[PDB]
Design a protein around this nucleic acid. Structure first.
Lengths: 17, 209, 120, 122, 56, 114
RNA sequence: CGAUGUCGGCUCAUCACAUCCUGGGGCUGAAGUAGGUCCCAAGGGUAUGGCUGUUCGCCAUUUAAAGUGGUACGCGAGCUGGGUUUAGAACGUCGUGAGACAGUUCGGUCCCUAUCUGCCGUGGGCGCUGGAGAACUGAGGGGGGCUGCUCCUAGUACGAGAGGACCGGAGUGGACGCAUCACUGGUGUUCGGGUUGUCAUGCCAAUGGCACUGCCCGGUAGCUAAAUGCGGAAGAGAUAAGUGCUGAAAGCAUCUAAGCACGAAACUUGCCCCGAGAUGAGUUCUCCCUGACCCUUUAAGGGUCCUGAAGGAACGUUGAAGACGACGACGUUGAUAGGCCGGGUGUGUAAGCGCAGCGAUGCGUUGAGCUAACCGGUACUAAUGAACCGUGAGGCUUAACCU
RNA sequence: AAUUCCUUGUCGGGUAAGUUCCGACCUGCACGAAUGGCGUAAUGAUGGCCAGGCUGUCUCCACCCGAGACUCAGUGAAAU
RNA sequence: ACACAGGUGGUCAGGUAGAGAAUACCAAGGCGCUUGAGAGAACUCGGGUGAAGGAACUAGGCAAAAUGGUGCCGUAACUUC
RNA sequence: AGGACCGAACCGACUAAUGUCGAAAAAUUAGCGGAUGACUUGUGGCUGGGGGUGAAAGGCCAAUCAAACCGGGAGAUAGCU
């Protein structure tokens, strides 16, 4: 109903390069 | 040949004249009364059903009371039967004493092992624990991997996992009989036998002669 | 697996468990009847009834030993003067537990524990 | 109960005083050595004038253990330290001339006659 | 860790089949006062096995 | 149990002298070498006594030439023949395990003189 | 590419056989021990450390052997993050430079409460047909299957000597598995004791609270290993490679075409465990129920009154049974639990009083006092009389014996 | 060598065993003198290596004390 | 964003032991932190102890264990003294 | 005397574990560094976005920084989904 005002910032655990 | 039903009574050791001490389990084998004899004509196999001990008159149910009364045998706790070896015969109401173990040297003891309840893989299957340090996180006694990958796609049946441990019947075989005491109804066998004190045990001559 | 072990833990540490029985033993002696949960009442039989047994014979050593438990001079006075002689011919079983339904707050099985007395 | 990396004293007078067990012989994946089991050791410090120098690998036999030994009647023998005797790697043959301290009789295997003879007690 | 398809109401009811409660259906009548009470429990008024035990 | 207790009682020996921890004791034990049987003397200090009836045992510590030796004897075993007491240590502890660390002049104990 | 985490290590494995060991054989430039090569065989077993992130490899020392491969180069919703592979910094080199370099160093966030399948455990429901309580048969399934050394044979056979068997028997080990607590021990914050600081009970003495159980010393029962017993089989059946007997086709020869023999840790059984939901639902023993009215769309039908047995469940006391269910014992015609009495065990000479000493303290009473889970007893307390579920002789067809 | 591909350069020390570390040689791919060179006592939550003590890190885990997990009563989410 | 294990400047600050505003136990004073009751499985978290061995673990002694105060004696290489 | 030493308050955050739909949009527990100084802190001011400030990391500038936030050009453009 209400857009979360905060969006958590994730991380890249797995480079997958 | 037939076995006998006894009750485990603690443990002790016997000191021999030469000095060595023999740890012995004491089994109380009182008179075993035959309640039913089976034959190939009726049951398709030959066996004798025996009873031991005593039961409260008001505790034995009517179906069991009539079964004992038919054989003229005083009510006992539980019923066990042993297959015959074709070389011996028995009659209903006959009493079997521990003296039959006088001429034997090895016996097999069967009983219910002590119940450990729900046990982990380390205790149940002797799994090796993982490192307690060096970064380990919440995986000190966990089983670890249980399968390979997509290619199987499943966990194989018979996998070793945590679960109920103990409280099943197990047999310890080829136990030396140390002493037989007919008048006092004792059977000293070298070693340890499954189950705790007061648990019912089945003793038969060793089959791995 | 606690084979053959005895003594309820009651979700308390040793020190808290010891104090709680110490107080609630003293309450039972003072009032001669109290209402508690069934598990607590059962475990009290093993700490209160030994005290009455100690109070059977009055001596300085017994008085000091009795005082070391319950740490109350009123309770020690109550013992050795009333409980002692009252149970002189009684061979144990000085208590009695009567289940009294369930506690409304959390549905704890509750029970009354009371000395075999108060027949006035 | 002697396992790899264990310090042992030397009962004989071969010149070695402290040795390290580096292997337990007599079986694959064997864990620890008993009262009279042969082990492979390395000398960690010896007499300069002795016939055995530091950092040499040769066999040894345990004669005393802190854990102790069990007698058939239930008795046990325990010591305040672990001791061994040096060997020759081809034939057992303790190289020492005398051995100090008590030695248990568990070494009577129709072979350690030299060890028991030199033993001041038992 | 999370479902791939939402279980149906059929599966929900099947799981809940074991959640049904059971009635005591074991109410005893006091010897003297004739008051229904749970077995091995004192009555509401404070009777047990006939004799009054609470006196309150 | 009654059955067990009766079974152990018949195996007892009534010639067990009364001794306490800290008492110097010489215990005579049987030794067999193939076919010959000899008496060996073990003298030391009783540092712990275990009372369990037929399973009762005591341990004796002696200072040998270099290191101490601790032996645990089963009181009622046929191996032990006789137990004799020389000194009466005036200790007040059931288990004298602290004597292991001590040595020399610190390993001696007083005399009960009772 | 609207995301399949990609090297090693740990834990846990499973399969193939192109077999490393153990087992059975052919040939040998196979005297014997020890080998070489090939065939059959996958039952079990198939290292520990130093260096490096390493797999690998080198090295050290063991073993009967330290097998080769598949499984997302098995396994990160099981663990780690050392290497590689973000952002900092430096060196060498390339570039005027920003910067770059399978060039090298120092440092550097690894999320998930399991719906489904699967797997390890454990229950409820119904079925198996009158119901109930027991004991079993066993279809079927699973577990286990490893082996060294010493001695005898014998110092025999063999061999110029040096060296040194086959087959068979006995003893004693390693690793692995099951069980157990009698012994040796660990633990034992529920037992006893010592002791430091402080607060409190009027004060001394004596005790309690708190300081990681305040710090320690022992230690009961349980659980437990390092402790103590036991196990791997023997035997039988059918075989693999192989060796054969007799024997023609093909007058001979030939293990094969007919026929008859042996022949391995493989296969089936033997040993242990689960097991009749084995819907193909089995067998045996014992126990309980054998009263009346009506109705119709007269059916293996429905309704009412009276009886509800065997047994079960529920509740309580509980257990060496247990996550909860379940399982076992007991409920007064009673030792199920608690307490109590006695004993044992453990700790170790209580408090009080008396004596000696200026005192700390010591001695006597005193191996005292206190003792958890242990052992043998004892109805002292709590396990209530009852209620609840479960019925009233159990279908049709056919066959065989009485009638 | 914080610089070295070939490379775990060669020899020695240390370990039973040392691609790490320490010392020496120079065949310095591609050190070098204020984008400073070589030493340097003291200092460093700085990198590497070795030794004594110490230990459950480990061989190999066992028991115990508490908080969750489990059952009952009340309240009652989330990603998908 | 919450009746949120966080953050928020200054003043007073007692007794016993202690160098001390450290630390332990307390006074004045204030609180038991707004879900409880049972059971006493695996496993996780925070702790205690441990036979024999003592880094064999591991990328690495990570983490744990250990040392720990006062007074006296004594104290090396090197050094900018 | 000392950008001196040990160590609380105070300031900071080297290691480990827990916690990752947490008590918490970086915390807690046990250790750890500085702790008379180039220290720390209260109150009030000044520096404004191609600008500030920076013991210099492309760090910080209201939980947002290799060019903050708000409104407008604006329905920018999108051979792409």
């Amino acid at each position: 109903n209400n857009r979360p005002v905060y969006i958590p910032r994730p991380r890249p655990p797995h480079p997958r390069l | 040949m037939i076995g006998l039903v006894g009750k485990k009574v603690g443990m002790t050791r016997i000191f021999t004249e030469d000095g060595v001490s023999i740890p012995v389990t004491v089994i109380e084998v009182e008179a075993n009364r035959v309640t039913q004899v089976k034959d190939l004509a009726n049951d398709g196999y030959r066996a004798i059903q025996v009873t031991t001990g005593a039961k409260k008159a008001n505790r034995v149910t009517k179906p069991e009371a009539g079964h004992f009364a038919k054989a003229g045998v005083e009510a006992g706790r539980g019923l066990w039967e042993f297959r015959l070896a074709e070389g011996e015969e028995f009659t209903v109401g006959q009493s079997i004493s521990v003296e039959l173990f006088a001429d034997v040297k090895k016996v097999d003891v069967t009983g219910t092992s002590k119940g450990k309840g729900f046990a982990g893989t380390v205790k149940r299957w002797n799994f090796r624990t993982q490192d307690a340090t060096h970064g380990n996180s919440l995986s000190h006694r966990v089983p670890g991997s249980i399968g390979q990958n997509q290619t199987p796609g499943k966990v194989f049946k018979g996998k070793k996992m945590a679960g109920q441990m103990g409280n099943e019947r197990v047999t310890v075989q080829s136990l030396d009989v140390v002493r037989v005491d007919a008048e006092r109804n004792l059977l000293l066998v070298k070693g340890a036998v499954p189950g705790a004190t007061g648990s019912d045990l089945i003793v038969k001559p060793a089959v791995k002669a | 697996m606690r084979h053959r072990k005895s003594g309820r833990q009651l979700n308390r540490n040793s020190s808290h468990r010891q104090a709680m029985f110490r107080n609630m033993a003293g309450s039972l002696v003072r009032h001669e009847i109290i209402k508690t949960t069934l598990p607590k009442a059962k475990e009290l039989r093993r700490v209160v009834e030994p005290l009455i047994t100690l109070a059977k014979t009055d001596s300085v050593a017994n008085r000091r030993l009795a005082f070391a438990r319950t740490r109350d001079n009123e309770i020690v006075a109550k013992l050795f003067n009333e409980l002692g002689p009252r149970f002189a011919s009684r061979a144990g079983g000085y208590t009695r537990i009567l289940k009294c339904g369930f506690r409304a707050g959390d549905n704890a099985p509750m029970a009354y524990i009371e000395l075999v007395d108060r027949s006035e | 109960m002697i396992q790899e990396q264990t310090m042992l004293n030397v009962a004989d007078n071969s010149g070695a005083r402290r040795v390290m067990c580096i292997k337990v012989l007599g079986g694959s994946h064997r864990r620890y050595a008993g009262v009279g089991d042969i082990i492979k050791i390395t000398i960690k410090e010896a007499i300069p004038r002795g016939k055995v120098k530091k950092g040499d690998v040769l066999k040894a036999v345990v004669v005393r253990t802190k854990k102790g030994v069990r007698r058939p009647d239930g008795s046990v023998i325990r010591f305040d330290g672990n001791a061994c005797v040096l060997l020759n790697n081809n034939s057992e043959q303790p190289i020492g001339t005398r051995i100090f301290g008590p030695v248990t009789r568990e070494l009577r295997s129709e072979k350690f006659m030299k060890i028991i003879s030199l033993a001041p007690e038992v | 860790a999370v479902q791939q398809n939402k279980p149906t109401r059929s599966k929900r009811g099947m799981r809940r089949s074991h959640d049904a409660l059971t009635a005591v259906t074991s109410l005893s009548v006091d010897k003297t006062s004739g008051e229904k009470h749970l077995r091995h429990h004192i009555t509401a008024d404070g009777y047990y096995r006939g004799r009054k035990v609470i006196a309150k | 149990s009654n059955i067990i207790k009766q079974l152990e009682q018949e195996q007892m020996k009534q010639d067990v002298p009364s001794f306490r921890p800290g008492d110097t004791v010489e215990v005579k034990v049987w030794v067999v070498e193939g076919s010959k049987k000899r008496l060996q003397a073990f003298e030391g200090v009783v540092i712990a006594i275990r009372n369990r009836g037929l399973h009762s045992a005591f341990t004796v510590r002696k200072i040998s030439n270099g290191e101490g030796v601790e032996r645990v004897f089963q009181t009622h075993s046929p191996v032990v023949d006789s137990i004799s007491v020389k000194r009466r240590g005036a200790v007040r502890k059931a288990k004298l395990y602290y004597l292991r660390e001590r040595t020399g002049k610190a390993a001696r104990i007083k005399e009960r003189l009772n």
